[PDB]
């Protein structure tokens, strides 16, 4: 019967907050599998959260389609009216090794435009949300655009194991310091908060970055491919989320000297 | 008995500190010490002076070795010694207002007796009490499960080591993270979240609490040559799960070592 964004937001926040009741059990009985190789992990926590959201969607928004990490998405196209992108646990490695520093990522796109976004830092019970027209919130405290941050004054975050070492060194020298949380959504939220200058992921999936688009728009962040272009939310791309004042400097470092790949 | 009596007093000082810290941050002021990356705030200075007055008041004979103070004096052989990092992770305080802590450790005749790592932004107090155990907000911490390096996340500062040995560490461990406060990176080792934390040039206050936690939870805490660390002075150091300590040290010292060669 046609809902407002706030009615949809109310349903989602409510389903997210009631996953607090479900997760301690999943964790107590955690089981791990591998996908691409031995370190590419998936657990019963990832699988249950995803399938519960599937079931939520069947039951509230049955027209709506789901693009999500732990299933095939062959059926998802260019011309989808109502689309949810989900990472049921972003930072699975941190879930398994630490039970901390992981989140649930959700993002709703209406005829391809980001309308609702969610990053649930469950270990710390901090629900980041973005709502087109209302703004961005952490547990309902409203977020505002961070202070300008030049790279020399700012902490940066990226996976240093996946890049050419010279370019890792150049990023070290040009920033104030380096930090890594190890969940794309959480390291992104440190940028949104203004705690990090920038977060780079040179090969994310759609679900690792899906919520961040609307955060970047509402809080005046740069979120681009490492070529400085728009990212297709339906497909990967190498990406940066950054404060406005250090975006260009970071991209120029990444692309210098033949670029950031190990073989250049 | 006496450790619990002193412990109750530290715990309630640290409790009152929650009420002080918002005020200090309200009027936060920042300066640099050694260079542009070496920060000190009034949060650091005031937390320190207040512990100092606490000690003046209750334990006049006890000495204090603390970051924001000259520590000429101090010797050699002192009976009651406190080592204090008033804010460990000042860079995180200033840049992030998160992932910083207070480190306090009490040595009786040179032997660790009480130790505190207060993660003030999460209001989590890790404490250790000789004869009683280690605790997080009152719940007992247990020895963590064995972690071989290849199964362990490790934490260290990659910017102060040559990049060959950084790569060797990356290739040998499960993965790499950094919290960026010695106290908190160390607690993750104590909790079994990390296999090991390295700091290649810590001050005495950056690692002072950690001795007792390592002792009581069966961690290894040594110099990077595997020797005992003198708590009165820094040394390059590692705190480690007992099952990945040798492997880390071996990598760190292999191939002519971890220092920068350019
Ligand atoms: Mg995964
Ligand atoms: Mg995931
Ligand atoms: Mg300092
Ligand atoms: Mg300090």
Short mmCIF file of C-alpha atoms and ligand atoms in Angstrom, two decimals:
data_model
loop_
_atom_site.label_atom_id
_atom_site.label_comp_id
_atom_site.label_asym_id
_atom_site.label_seq_id
_atom_site.Cartn_x
_atom_site.Cartn_y
_atom_site.Cartn_z
CA UNK A 1 0.00 0.00 0.00
CA UNK A 2 2.96 2.51 -0.58
CA UNK A 3 5.23 3.47 2.33
CA UNK A 4 7.15 6.54 3.27
CA UNK A 5 10.98 6.36 3.53
CA UNK A 6 10.55 6.79 7.29
CA UNK A 7 8.19 3.85 7.43
CA UNK A 8 10.68 1.78 5.56
CA UNK A 9 13.50 3.06 7.83
CA UNK A 10 11.38 2.16 10.87
CA UNK A 11 10.99 -1.46 9.58
CA UNK A 12 14.72 -1.87 8.81
CA UNK A 13 16.04 -0.33 12.04
CA UNK A 14 13.65 -2.56 13.92
CA UNK A 15 14.78 -5.78 12.11
CA UNK A 16 18.45 -4.74 12.68
CA UNK A 17 18.02 -4.00 16.36
CA UNK A 18 16.22 -7.32 16.89
CA UNK A 19 19.16 -9.20 15.33
CA UNK A 20 20.86 -8.40 18.77
CA UNK A 21 18.65 -11.23 20.13
CA UNK A 22 19.79 -13.69 17.44
CA UNK A 23 23.57 -13.16 17.07
CA UNK A 24 24.91 -14.22 20.52
CA UNK A 25 23.52 -17.68 19.81
CA UNK A 26 24.93 -17.89 16.25
CA UNK A 27 28.32 -16.87 17.67
CA UNK A 28 28.14 -19.46 20.47
CA UNK A 29 27.68 -22.13 17.76
CA UNK A 30 29.92 -20.58 15.09
CA UNK A 31 30.99 -22.73 12.23
CA UNK A 32 33.33 -21.62 9.40
CA UNK A 33 33.65 -22.48 5.71
CA UNK A 34 36.00 -21.30 2.94
CA UNK A 35 35.06 -19.95 -0.50
CA UNK A 36 37.75 -18.69 -2.97
CA UNK A 37 40.70 -20.04 -0.87
CA UNK A 38 41.47 -20.94 2.71
CA UNK A 39 41.39 -17.35 4.13
CA UNK A 40 38.17 -16.28 2.29
CA UNK A 41 35.79 -17.13 5.19
CA UNK A 42 31.98 -17.51 5.62
CA UNK A 43 30.17 -18.58 8.77
CA UNK A 44 26.74 -19.65 9.92
CA UNK A 45 26.43 -16.10 11.27
CA UNK A 46 26.86 -14.60 7.76
CA UNK A 47 24.47 -17.25 6.25
CA UNK A 48 21.67 -16.95 8.86
CA UNK A 49 21.66 -13.11 8.93
CA UNK A 50 21.40 -13.11 5.13
CA UNK A 51 18.62 -15.59 4.98
CA UNK A 52 16.69 -13.89 7.75
CA UNK A 53 16.82 -10.69 5.73
CA UNK A 54 15.64 -12.56 2.64
CA UNK A 55 12.71 -13.81 4.62
CA UNK A 56 12.06 -10.24 6.01
CA UNK A 57 12.00 -8.98 2.49
CA UNK A 58 9.73 -11.78 1.20
CA UNK A 59 7.31 -10.77 3.86
CA UNK A 60 7.32 -6.92 3.73
CA UNK A 61 8.48 -5.81 0.30
CA UNK A 62 7.93 -8.88 -1.85
CA UNK A 63 8.59 -6.97 -5.13
CA UNK A 64 11.97 -5.90 -3.77
CA UNK A 65 15.09 -7.66 -5.08
CA UNK A 66 18.26 -8.71 -3.06
CA UNK A 67 21.89 -8.46 -4.22
CA UNK A 68 23.90 -10.16 -1.42
CA UNK A 69 27.24 -11.71 -0.67
CA UNK A 70 26.38 -15.27 0.32
CA UNK A 71 24.12 -16.31 -2.63
CA UNK A 72 24.25 -16.03 -6.39
CA UNK A 73 23.05 -12.78 -7.90
CA UNK A 74 22.81 -13.89 -11.58
CA UNK A 75 19.16 -12.71 -11.70
CA UNK A 76 20.03 -9.03 -10.81
CA UNK A 77 19.93 -6.55 -13.72
CA UNK A 78 20.47 -2.95 -14.84
CA UNK A 79 16.75 -2.09 -14.64
CA UNK A 80 15.66 -3.07 -11.11
CA UNK A 81 13.11 -0.71 -9.47
CA UNK A 82 13.53 -1.71 -5.79
CA UNK A 83 16.91 -3.13 -4.89
CA UNK A 84 18.54 -4.02 -1.59
CA UNK A 85 22.28 -4.70 -1.45
CA UNK A 86 23.43 -6.66 1.63
CA UNK A 87 26.68 -7.67 3.26
CA UNK A 88 25.38 -9.86 6.09
CA UNK A 89 28.69 -9.74 7.93
CA UNK A 90 31.25 -7.28 6.58
CA UNK A 91 34.59 -8.18 8.23
CA UNK A 92 34.01 -11.96 8.55
CA UNK A 93 37.74 -12.43 9.29
CA UNK A 94 37.43 -10.06 12.29
CA UNK A 95 34.23 -11.85 13.39
CA UNK A 96 36.03 -15.22 13.37
CA UNK A 97 39.39 -14.09 14.82
CA UNK A 98 38.20 -11.37 17.16
CA UNK A 99 34.42 -11.25 17.57
CA UNK A 100 34.83 -7.53 17.22
CA UNK A 101 35.25 -4.99 14.42
CA UNK A 102 32.60 -6.31 12.04
CA UNK A 103 29.27 -4.91 10.83
CA UNK A 104 26.16 -5.64 8.81
CA UNK A 105 25.77 -3.57 5.62
CA UNK A 106 22.40 -2.70 3.99
CA UNK A 107 21.54 -0.33 1.18
CA UNK A 108 18.30 0.36 -0.69
CA UNK A 109 18.32 1.78 -4.20
CA UNK A 110 15.19 3.07 -5.89
CA UNK A 111 15.53 3.04 -9.73
CA UNK A 112 19.26 3.07 -9.09
CA UNK A 113 19.31 6.04 -6.63
CA UNK A 114 20.51 5.41 -3.01
CA UNK A 115 17.56 6.12 -0.66
CA UNK A 116 18.39 4.19 2.62
CA UNK A 117 21.79 2.95 3.94
CA UNK A 118 22.82 1.06 7.03
CA UNK A 119 26.11 0.06 8.71
CA UNK A 120 25.47 -1.81 11.94
CA UNK A 121 28.52 -2.01 14.14
CA UNK A 122 27.01 -4.81 16.16
CA UNK A 123 29.92 -5.45 18.63
CA UNK A 124 29.57 -1.86 19.81
CA UNK A 125 25.76 -1.56 19.26
CA UNK A 126 26.20 1.48 16.96
CA UNK A 127 23.66 1.69 14.11
CA UNK A 128 24.93 4.05 11.43
CA UNK A 129 22.10 5.02 9.07
CA UNK A 130 21.59 7.40 6.16
CA UNK A 131 18.11 8.52 4.97
CA UNK A 132 17.65 10.68 1.87
CA UNK A 133 15.89 13.89 3.00
CA UNK A 134 16.55 13.35 6.75
CA UNK A 135 20.39 12.92 7.04
CA UNK A 136 22.90 10.49 8.56
CA UNK A 137 22.77 9.19 12.14
CA UNK A 138 24.70 7.02 14.61
CA UNK A 139 22.13 5.60 17.05
CA UNK A 140 19.99 8.53 16.18
CA UNK A 141 22.65 11.12 17.00
CA UNK A 142 22.84 13.13 13.68
CA UNK A 143 26.21 13.13 11.87
CA UNK A 144 27.47 16.28 10.07
CA UNK A 145 30.11 16.83 7.38
CA UNK A 146 33.58 16.27 9.03
CA UNK A 147 36.24 19.11 9.32
CA UNK A 148 38.45 19.56 6.25
CA UNK A 149 41.40 17.22 6.51
CA UNK A 150 44.60 17.59 4.50
CA UNK A 151 46.36 14.22 4.04
CA UNK A 152 49.47 15.28 6.08
CA UNK A 153 47.11 15.85 9.06
CA UNK A 154 45.03 12.69 8.68
CA UNK A 155 45.07 8.98 9.48
CA UNK A 156 44.61 6.71 6.50
CA UNK A 157 43.45 3.18 6.18
CA UNK A 158 43.92 0.53 3.49
CA UNK A 159 45.01 -3.09 3.04
CA UNK A 160 48.79 -2.74 2.78
CA UNK A 161 49.19 -6.46 1.85
CA UNK A 162 47.56 -6.09 -1.46
CA UNK A 163 49.50 -3.17 -2.89
CA UNK A 164 52.91 -2.46 -4.31
CA UNK A 165 55.20 -1.62 -1.39
CA UNK A 166 56.52 1.64 -2.91
CA UNK A 167 53.01 2.93 -3.05
CA UNK A 168 52.34 1.72 0.47
CA UNK A 169 55.48 3.66 1.53
CA UNK A 170 54.28 6.78 -0.31
CA UNK A 171 50.90 6.64 1.47
CA UNK A 172 52.71 6.22 4.86
CA UNK A 173 55.01 9.25 4.20
CA UNK A 174 52.24 11.61 3.01
CA UNK A 175 49.68 10.92 5.83
CA UNK A 176 49.78 11.71 9.54
CA UNK A 177 49.62 7.95 10.44
CA UNK A 178 48.15 4.59 9.36
CA UNK A 179 45.45 2.56 11.06
CA UNK A 180 43.30 -0.43 10.01
CA UNK A 181 40.01 -1.64 11.49
CA UNK A 182 39.65 -4.33 8.78
CA UNK A 183 35.97 -4.07 7.94
CA UNK A 184 35.26 -1.91 4.84
CA UNK A 185 32.08 -0.50 6.34
CA UNK A 186 33.74 0.37 9.62
CA UNK A 187 36.89 1.86 8.17
CA UNK A 188 34.43 3.85 5.90
CA UNK A 189 32.51 5.14 8.87
CA UNK A 190 35.79 6.36 10.46
CA UNK A 191 36.12 8.56 7.31
CA UNK A 192 32.47 9.74 7.63
CA UNK A 193 33.06 10.63 11.29
CA UNK A 194 36.27 12.50 10.34
CA UNK A 195 38.58 10.10 12.41
CA UNK A 196 40.35 8.90 9.16
CA UNK A 197 41.14 11.07 6.09
CA UNK A 198 40.47 8.22 3.70
CA UNK A 199 39.87 4.49 3.33
CA UNK A 200 40.93 2.59 0.21
CA UNK A 201 39.77 -0.89 -0.95
CA UNK A 202 41.35 -1.85 -4.33
CA UNK A 203 38.92 -4.63 -5.01
CA UNK A 204 35.60 -4.42 -3.15
CA UNK A 205 32.40 -6.29 -4.00
CA UNK A 206 29.11 -4.41 -4.45
CA UNK A 207 27.98 -5.31 -0.86
CA UNK A 208 31.27 -4.10 0.84
CA UNK A 209 30.56 -0.51 -0.36
CA UNK A 210 26.79 -0.38 -0.95
CA UNK A 211 25.73 1.76 2.05
CA UNK A 212 28.61 4.19 1.77
CA UNK A 213 27.26 5.98 -1.38
CA UNK A 214 24.48 7.70 0.51
CA UNK A 215 26.74 8.46 3.49
CA UNK A 216 29.25 10.11 1.12
CA UNK A 217 26.53 12.19 -0.58
CA UNK A 218 24.84 13.39 2.65
CA UNK A 219 28.10 14.14 4.51
CA UNK A 220 30.01 15.71 1.54
CA UNK A 221 32.65 12.93 1.24
CA UNK A 222 34.37 11.90 -1.98
CA UNK A 223 33.63 8.33 -2.95
CA UNK A 224 35.10 7.37 -6.32
CA UNK A 225 36.94 4.74 -8.30
CA UNK A 226 40.72 5.06 -7.94
CA UNK A 227 40.53 6.83 -11.36
CA UNK A 228 38.31 9.46 -9.75
CA UNK A 229 35.11 8.29 -11.52
CA UNK A 230 31.60 7.29 -10.32
CA UNK A 231 31.31 3.69 -9.17
CA UNK A 232 28.68 1.37 -10.43
CA UNK A 233 26.85 0.19 -7.27
CA UNK A 234 25.88 -2.97 -9.18
CA UNK A 235 29.51 -4.02 -9.80
CA UNK A 236 32.82 -3.83 -8.02
CA UNK A 237 35.31 -1.15 -8.51
CA UNK A 238 38.61 -0.24 -6.87
CA UNK A 239 37.47 2.55 -4.58
CA UNK A 240 38.27 5.28 -2.16
CA UNK A 241 36.01 6.98 0.41
CA UNK A 242 37.72 10.25 1.47
CA UNK A 243 37.47 13.55 3.17
CA UNK A 244 37.16 16.32 0.44
CA UNK A 245 40.53 17.90 1.38
CA UNK A 246 42.77 14.80 0.83
CA UNK A 247 40.95 12.88 -1.94
CA UNK A 248 43.02 14.22 -4.84
CA UNK A 249 46.33 13.87 -3.02
CA UNK A 250 45.56 10.19 -2.21
CA UNK A 251 44.49 9.38 -5.77
CA UNK A 252 47.57 10.99 -7.23
CA UNK A 253 49.83 8.91 -4.85
CA UNK A 254 47.99 5.70 -5.81
CA UNK A 255 48.33 6.35 -9.53
CA UNK A 256 52.00 7.67 -9.49
CA UNK A 257 54.91 5.68 -10.87
CA UNK A 258 52.84 3.17 -12.86
CA UNK A 259 50.15 2.83 -10.11
CA UNK A 260 49.51 0.71 -7.06
CA UNK A 261 49.52 -2.90 -8.26
CA UNK A 262 52.39 -5.20 -7.18
CA UNK A 263 53.25 -5.64 -10.88
CA UNK A 264 53.41 -2.22 -12.47
CA UNK B 1 44.69 -8.00 52.21
CA UNK B 2 46.59 -5.12 50.87
CA UNK B 3 46.47 -5.49 47.06
CA UNK B 4 42.65 -5.54 47.08
CA UNK B 5 42.61 -2.54 49.32
CA UNK B 6 44.88 -0.53 46.99
CA UNK B 7 42.95 -1.95 44.02
CA UNK B 8 39.61 -0.70 45.34
CA UNK B 9 41.14 2.77 45.64
CA UNK B 10 42.57 2.76 42.06
CA UNK B 11 39.25 1.51 40.71
CA UNK B 12 37.39 4.32 42.36
CA UNK B 13 39.98 6.96 41.25
CA UNK B 14 39.56 5.68 37.66
CA UNK B 15 35.79 5.92 38.14
CA UNK B 16 36.08 9.56 39.19
CA UNK B 17 38.33 10.07 36.12
CA UNK B 18 35.22 9.49 33.89
CA UNK B 19 33.81 12.62 35.39
CA UNK B 20 36.99 14.62 34.89
CA UNK B 21 37.70 13.54 31.27
CA UNK B 22 34.69 15.24 29.50
CA UNK B 23 35.74 18.59 31.08
CA UNK B 24 39.37 18.22 29.95
CA UNK B 25 38.24 17.38 26.39
CA UNK B 26 35.76 20.29 26.41
CA UNK B 27 38.76 22.58 26.69
CA UNK B 28 41.25 20.32 24.92
CA UNK B 29 44.50 21.92 24.00
CA UNK B 30 47.22 20.19 21.85
CA UNK B 31 51.05 20.72 21.55
CA UNK B 32 53.83 18.72 19.92
CA UNK B 33 56.94 17.41 21.74
CA UNK B 34 59.65 15.66 19.72
CA UNK B 35 58.23 16.42 16.20
CA UNK B 36 54.86 17.03 14.48
CA UNK B 37 53.62 13.44 15.12
CA UNK B 38 54.47 13.39 18.81
CA UNK B 39 51.50 14.92 20.53
CA UNK B 40 50.58 15.93 24.11
CA UNK B 41 47.28 17.43 25.29
CA UNK B 42 46.09 18.86 28.55
CA UNK B 43 44.15 15.52 28.92
CA UNK B 44 47.57 13.84 29.17
CA UNK B 45 49.04 16.40 31.55
CA UNK B 46 46.05 16.75 33.87
CA UNK B 47 45.30 13.01 34.19
CA UNK B 48 48.92 12.68 35.20
CA UNK B 49 49.04 15.48 37.78
CA UNK B 50 45.82 14.23 39.40
CA UNK B 51 47.18 10.76 39.82
CA UNK B 52 50.20 12.43 41.25
CA UNK B 53 48.09 14.30 43.84
CA UNK B 54 46.19 11.04 44.56
CA UNK B 55 49.53 9.45 45.42
CA UNK B 56 50.81 12.47 47.39
CA UNK B 57 47.53 12.10 49.42
CA UNK B 58 47.37 8.33 50.00
CA UNK B 59 50.81 6.94 49.34
CA UNK B 60 53.47 9.71 49.86
CA UNK B 61 56.30 7.23 49.91
CA UNK B 62 55.35 5.74 46.48
CA UNK B 63 57.25 7.06 43.48
CA UNK B 64 55.90 7.90 40.01
CA UNK B 65 57.54 7.27 36.63
CA UNK B 66 55.24 9.02 34.13
CA UNK B 67 55.38 10.16 30.56
CA UNK B 68 54.74 13.90 30.92
CA UNK B 69 57.25 14.48 33.78
CA UNK B 70 60.93 14.46 34.03
CA UNK B 71 61.97 11.09 35.56
CA UNK B 72 65.55 11.95 36.63
CA UNK B 73 65.52 10.68 40.16
CA UNK B 74 64.52 7.67 39.95
CA UNK B 75 66.91 4.55 40.48
CA UNK B 76 67.75 1.32 40.51
CA UNK B 77 66.14 0.03 43.72
CA UNK B 78 62.78 1.74 44.74
CA UNK B 79 60.23 -0.08 46.94
CA UNK B 80 56.91 1.30 45.85
CA UNK B 81 56.84 2.45 42.20
CA UNK B 82 54.00 3.44 39.93
CA UNK B 83 54.47 3.74 36.19
CA UNK B 84 51.87 5.77 34.38
CA UNK B 85 50.92 6.53 30.79
CA UNK B 86 48.22 9.12 31.39
CA UNK B 87 46.98 8.85 27.80
CA UNK B 88 48.50 6.06 25.75
CA UNK B 89 47.42 6.70 22.18
CA UNK B 90 47.48 10.54 22.28
CA UNK B 91 47.49 10.52 18.45
CA UNK B 92 44.21 8.52 18.53
CA UNK B 93 42.80 10.83 21.19
CA UNK B 94 43.48 13.92 19.10
CA UNK B 95 42.74 12.57 15.60
CA UNK B 96 39.88 10.20 16.47
CA UNK B 97 38.72 10.80 20.06
CA UNK B 98 38.64 6.94 20.23
CA UNK B 99 41.19 4.04 20.79
CA UNK B 100 43.19 5.53 23.59
CA UNK B 101 43.68 4.37 27.15
CA UNK B 102 45.18 5.03 30.57
CA UNK B 103 48.07 2.71 31.59
CA UNK B 104 49.05 2.34 35.35
CA UNK B 105 51.21 -0.34 36.93
CA UNK B 106 52.45 -0.76 40.46
CA UNK B 107 55.76 -2.47 41.21
CA UNK B 108 56.64 -3.60 44.78
CA UNK B 109 60.41 -4.18 45.08
CA UNK B 110 60.59 -4.37 41.29
CA UNK B 111 57.89 -7.07 40.97
CA UNK B 112 54.52 -6.32 39.22
CA UNK B 113 51.60 -6.34 41.73
CA UNK B 114 48.79 -4.29 40.13
CA UNK B 115 48.16 -3.24 36.53
CA UNK B 116 45.46 -1.22 34.77
CA UNK B 117 44.55 -0.56 31.11
CA UNK B 118 41.48 1.66 31.05
CA UNK B 119 39.85 1.85 27.59
CA UNK B 120 38.05 4.99 28.53
CA UNK B 121 36.10 5.38 25.18
CA UNK B 122 34.54 1.94 25.71
CA UNK B 123 34.47 2.25 29.49
CA UNK B 124 36.30 -1.06 29.67
CA UNK B 125 38.75 -1.42 32.58
CA UNK B 126 41.22 -4.28 32.18
CA UNK B 127 42.97 -4.78 35.46
CA UNK B 128 45.38 -7.43 36.86
CA UNK B 129 45.95 -8.26 40.54
CA UNK B 130 48.77 -10.58 41.67
CA UNK B 131 47.23 -13.64 43.42
CA UNK B 132 43.75 -12.82 42.11
CA UNK B 133 43.91 -12.76 38.24
CA UNK B 134 43.08 -10.47 35.30
CA UNK B 135 39.67 -9.00 34.66
CA UNK B 136 37.66 -6.89 32.18
CA UNK B 137 35.11 -4.79 34.13
CA UNK B 138 35.09 -7.42 36.82
CA UNK B 139 34.74 -10.66 34.71
CA UNK B 140 37.73 -12.92 34.89
CA UNK B 141 39.96 -13.14 31.77
CA UNK B 142 41.31 -16.60 31.00
CA UNK B 143 44.49 -17.67 29.24
CA UNK B 144 43.60 -17.25 25.50
CA UNK B 145 43.56 -20.39 23.15
CA UNK B 146 46.86 -21.28 21.45
CA UNK B 147 47.40 -19.31 18.22
CA UNK B 148 50.03 -20.32 15.74
CA UNK B 149 51.13 -17.29 13.68
CA UNK B 150 49.60 -18.57 10.50
CA UNK B 151 46.19 -18.53 12.29
CA UNK B 152 46.80 -15.15 14.04
CA UNK B 153 46.11 -11.53 13.27
CA UNK B 154 49.20 -9.46 14.15
CA UNK B 155 49.69 -5.87 14.98
CA UNK B 156 52.70 -3.66 14.65
CA UNK B 157 53.82 -0.30 13.24
CA UNK B 158 54.77 -1.01 9.62
CA UNK B 159 56.28 2.52 9.09
CA UNK B 160 59.28 1.92 11.38
CA UNK B 161 60.53 -1.39 9.87
CA UNK B 162 62.09 -2.08 6.51
CA UNK B 163 59.47 -3.30 4.06
CA UNK B 164 61.09 -6.67 3.39
CA UNK B 165 60.49 -7.78 6.97
CA UNK B 166 56.99 -6.19 6.95
CA UNK B 167 56.19 -8.44 3.93
CA UNK B 168 57.65 -11.49 5.77
CA UNK B 169 55.25 -10.77 8.68
CA UNK B 170 52.29 -10.33 6.29
CA UNK B 171 53.14 -13.61 4.48
CA UNK B 172 53.48 -15.57 7.74
CA UNK B 173 50.37 -14.43 9.63
CA UNK B 174 46.67 -14.73 9.04
CA UNK B 175 46.28 -10.98 8.60
CA UNK B 176 47.34 -7.56 9.95
CA UNK B 177 45.45 -4.89 11.94
CA UNK B 178 46.45 -1.85 13.94
CA UNK B 179 44.59 -0.15 16.80
CA UNK B 180 47.43 2.32 17.37
CA UNK B 181 47.62 2.42 21.16
CA UNK B 182 50.19 0.04 22.73
CA UNK B 183 47.87 -0.64 25.65
CA UNK B 184 44.91 -1.59 23.43
CA UNK B 185 46.88 -3.57 20.77
CA UNK B 186 48.36 -5.42 23.77
CA UNK B 187 44.89 -6.17 25.29
CA UNK B 188 43.78 -7.71 22.04
CA UNK B 189 46.73 -10.18 22.41
CA UNK B 190 45.58 -10.78 26.03
CA UNK B 191 41.99 -11.46 24.82
CA UNK B 192 43.16 -13.85 22.05
CA UNK B 193 41.99 -11.47 19.29
CA UNK B 194 45.60 -10.87 18.10
CA UNK B 195 48.48 -13.36 18.12
CA UNK B 196 51.11 -10.71 18.89
CA UNK B 197 51.74 -6.99 19.15
CA UNK B 198 55.21 -5.46 18.42
CA UNK B 199 56.49 -2.05 19.35
CA UNK B 200 60.10 -1.57 18.30
CA UNK B 201 60.85 1.35 20.57
CA UNK B 202 58.36 1.72 23.42
CA UNK B 203 58.77 3.93 26.55
CA UNK B 204 58.44 2.32 30.01
CA UNK B 205 54.92 3.71 30.37
CA UNK B 206 53.70 2.38 27.01
CA UNK B 207 54.19 -1.24 28.22
CA UNK B 208 54.23 -1.08 32.05
CA UNK B 209 50.84 -2.67 32.78
CA UNK B 210 51.47 -5.41 30.30
CA UNK B 211 54.04 -7.41 32.39
CA UNK B 212 51.49 -8.59 34.94
CA UNK B 213 48.81 -9.35 32.28
CA UNK B 214 51.40 -11.44 30.36
CA UNK B 215 52.39 -13.27 33.56
CA UNK B 216 48.88 -14.02 34.78
CA UNK B 217 47.45 -15.02 31.35
CA UNK B 218 50.45 -17.02 30.14
CA UNK B 219 51.52 -14.69 27.32
CA UNK B 220 55.14 -14.14 26.35
CA UNK B 221 56.45 -10.62 26.79
CA UNK B 222 60.08 -10.12 25.94
CA UNK B 223 62.54 -8.01 24.07
CA UNK B 224 62.84 -8.63 20.36
CA UNK B 225 65.87 -10.84 21.26
CA UNK B 226 63.63 -12.85 23.57
CA UNK B 227 65.15 -11.45 26.83
CA UNK B 228 63.38 -10.03 29.94
CA UNK B 229 62.54 -6.37 29.57
CA UNK B 230 63.68 -3.89 32.14
CA UNK B 231 60.46 -2.15 33.21
CA UNK B 232 62.47 0.94 34.26
CA UNK B 233 63.69 1.51 30.73
CA UNK B 234 62.09 0.86 27.37
CA UNK B 235 63.28 -1.89 25.12
CA UNK B 236 62.08 -3.02 21.65
CA UNK B 237 59.32 -5.50 22.71
CA UNK B 238 56.67 -7.98 21.76
CA UNK B 239 53.67 -9.25 23.61
CA UNK B 240 52.57 -12.58 22.17
CA UNK B 241 50.43 -15.70 22.38
CA UNK B 242 52.77 -18.43 23.62
CA UNK B 243 52.20 -20.40 20.39
CA UNK B 244 53.38 -17.68 17.91
CA UNK B 245 56.08 -15.86 19.93
CA UNK B 246 59.15 -17.80 18.60
CA UNK B 247 58.03 -17.56 14.96
CA UNK B 248 57.54 -13.77 15.16
CA UNK B 249 60.95 -13.22 16.74
CA UNK B 250 62.58 -15.48 14.16
CA UNK B 251 61.04 -13.48 11.29
CA UNK B 252 61.86 -10.15 12.95
CA UNK B 253 65.55 -11.07 13.37
CA UNK B 254 65.95 -12.98 10.03
CA UNK B 255 67.59 -11.55 6.87
CA UNK B 256 69.70 -9.04 8.81
CA UNK B 257 66.76 -7.76 10.88
CA UNK B 258 63.77 -5.42 11.09
CA UNK B 259 65.41 -1.96 11.07
CA UNK B 260 65.16 0.41 8.08
CA UNK B 261 68.10 0.38 5.69
CA UNK B 262 66.81 3.52 3.80
MG1 LIG C 1 33.28 -12.54 2.68
MG1 LIG C 2 30.51 -10.10 4.13
MG1 LIG C 3 53.06 10.66 23.98
MG1 LIG C 4 51.09 8.71 26.65
#
